[PDB]
Design a protein around this ligand. Structure first.
Ligand SMILES: Nc1nc2c(ncn2[C@@H]2O[C@H](COP(=O)(O)OP(=O)(O)O)[C@@H](O)[C@H]2O)c(=O)[nH]1
Length: 315
């Protein structure tokens, strides 16, 4: 039997990451010379992250801890504002390192909810020593942590439990098209991704438009959509890892001011699940299957997928 799966969700919820995890787990996986192809993405990802923080400092009126840093800030734009592709040298690596390490820079970094910063900003920056190497070759995790906007509809075929799957990633924009989406009316299952860590984030261009709400609004559209009653709805409350760390310093009340529980991972996460599951009108007939995930964690996606597949077979 062939199972069709449609990944839906806002931008940066983890869709391509899950697609990548399917290749790694169910297919070949990323080869040494396949990883080399992201050597660049990794550099580009890293350069942009640091530039964003440095650029935010001004916007937020934050000062370097050391003034000799301003000379490094200037040097970053010279090396970056010269190259056209993501590269990496030893001088560049020094600049970035000294900046990363700076107190004023760390201060701006801890107020990242105020600006737009790649989630993996910190990961690449804390391993610059390693990714900066002359022969550096990205690892699977480095590839799973990259950030590439998928414009087209991506798909994958893998086999699992004598079942052949066909995953479709349409992206955020197309998840929205109320009409278009109709072309997918018979889908076996739909995996809807939500980024838990977005609760205290604003949607850039909109800057006052909370993202979790935007996702909540989209979940509502699909969930209660005529074309998917016969379609299973799986909810991946993704980024549980960054949520665990954020929740202990950024209250849920920022997202849900009516929240009265306490701000612990267990209570707050449960509050988010409920808010989503409750958007389901046909709650009588239709059941939503929720899962807390970490798309970059291959062990998690695997355990979790085994679970998803066990449900699809059952119904
Ligand atoms: N820490 C962390 N990073 C994640 C997780 N899921 C995805 N990412 C990162 O999220 C950013 C965007 O994810 P992506 O899968 O490109 O999302 P898409 O826009 O929905 O396809 C990338 O940097 C991903 O590596 C997660 O659970 N935890």
């Amino acid at each position: 039997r062939e199972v069709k799966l449609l990944l839906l969700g806002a931008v940066e919820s983890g869709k391509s990451t899950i697609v990548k995890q399917m290749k790694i787990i169910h297919e070949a996986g990323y080869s040494e010379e396949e990883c080399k192809q992201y050597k660049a993405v990794v550099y580009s990802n890293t350069i942009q992250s640091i530039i964003a923080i440095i650029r935010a400092m001004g916007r937020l009126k934050i000062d370097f801890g050391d003034a000799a840093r301003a000379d490094d800030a200037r040097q970053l734009f010279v090396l970056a504002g010269a190259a056209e592709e993501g590269f990496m040298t030893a001088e560049l690596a020094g600049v970035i390192k000294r900046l990363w390490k700076d107190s004023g820079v760390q201060a701006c970094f801890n107020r990242s909810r105020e600006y737009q910063l790649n989630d993996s900003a910190a990961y690449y920056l804390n391993d610059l020593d390693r990714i900066a190497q002359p022969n550096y070759i990205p690892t699977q995790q480095d590839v799973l942590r990259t950030r590439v906007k998928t414009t087209g509809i991506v798909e994958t075929h893998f086999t699992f439990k004598d079942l052949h799957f066909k995953m479709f990633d349409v992206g955020g924009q197309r998840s929205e098209r109320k009409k278009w989406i109709h072309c997918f009316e018979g889908v076996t299952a739909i995996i809807f991704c939500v980024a838990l860590s977005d609760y205290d984030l604003v949607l850039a261009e909109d800057e006052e438009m909370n993202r979790m709400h935007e996702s909540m609004k989209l979940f509502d559209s699909i969930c209660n959509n005529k074309w998917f009653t016969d379609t299973s709805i799986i909810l991946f409350l993704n980024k549980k890892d960054l949520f665990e760390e954020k929740i202990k310093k950024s209250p849920l009340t920022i997202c849900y001011p009516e929240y009265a529980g306490s701000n612990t991972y267990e209570e707050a996460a449960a509050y988010i699940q409920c808010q989503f599951e409750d958007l389901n009108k046909r709650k009588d007939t239709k059941e939503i299957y929720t899962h807390f995930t970490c798309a970059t964690d291959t062990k998690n996606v695997q355990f979790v997928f085994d679970a998803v597949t066990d449900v699809i077979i059952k119904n």
